[PDB]
Every structure is written in structure tokens, then in C-alpha cells.
Design a protein around this ligand. Sequence first.
Ligand code: HEM
Length: 123
Amino acid sequence: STLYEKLGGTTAVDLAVDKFYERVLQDDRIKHFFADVDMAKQRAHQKAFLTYAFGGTDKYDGRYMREAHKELVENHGLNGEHFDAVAEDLLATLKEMGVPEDLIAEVAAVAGAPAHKRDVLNQ
Ligand code: HEM
């Protein structure tokens, strides 16, 4: 079974992403990164992306992480502390949802992988 399946499939990822962005938009460390972002589109992209990242689909139909975040890094100071806040807010959300700690560990490994971090941060 994939991580996506184990989490609860579409409805779990849908709820997690909704809740995650509710948390992010109240998080003073990072909320301003989203000030000019269409959140309906963002929510849809993230549901699709995490579905992919959790093994629910073979491909992500949207931008690569590096291009997606380039303008934040170059113009808005996006750094490692912001990255950790995002990972932390994602894990807090799953925890709140009652996700078992072994699956939170699996998500931690995806969100913290260098192939993710280096591209997001354009490092
Ligand atoms: C790392 C945990 C991480 C993931 C995963 C992620 C996902 C993601 C997606 C799927 C998009 C949309 C891509 C598309 O257009 O197809 C996207 C875009 C934005 N992100 Fe992100 N993102 C991750 C990391 C971070 C971090 C650390 C921040 C800032 C605190 C951040 C923020 C944003 C913003 C803002 C956008 C929209 C950019 C824009 O078009 O204005 N992400 N992210």
C-alpha cells in the first residue's frame, strides 16, 4: 500500500491540505509568502503534488519545485527557517488529524529530503 493509501487516500490528503493552509496562514513566520497567492489554486496544486509525492500518482501535473519557489528565494528572502516552519506545520496538521507516528515519520522524510529542500530553496 502506498503512503497515500495508508494516510487515507483522496479525502485524507484533501483535509490535510485544507488544514495545513489554515495553519500556514496563521503562522507569522511564513504567512506573508502567500499574500499574493491564489489559495484555491494553491490548495489544488498541493493536493495534486502530495498525491504524487505520497505515491498516489506517477507524475505531478504542475511546476517543478525549483521554478515554483524561485521568485520567493530571489525577491522575498525564502530560507531554511521558512522551510522548517512549512515542514513543521505540515507534520503538526497530520498529528492533529490522528495520523500514526510511523506515517508522520514517512511524511517527515519526504518533506525534509535534500532533493526537495535544495530545489525549493534554489540552493
Ligand atoms: C516542501 C515541503 C514544499 C512543497 C512540497 C511545496 C509545494 C508547492 C506546490 C505544489 C506549489 C505549486 C506549484 C505549481 O505551481 O504547480 C508551491 C508553490 C508555492 N509555495 Fe511551496 N512547497 C514547499 C515548500 C515551500 C516553502 C518552504 C514555502 C514558504 C514558506 C512555500 C511557499 C509557496 C508559495 C508562496 C507558492 C506559490 C508561488 C507563487 O506562484 O506565487 N513552499 N509549493
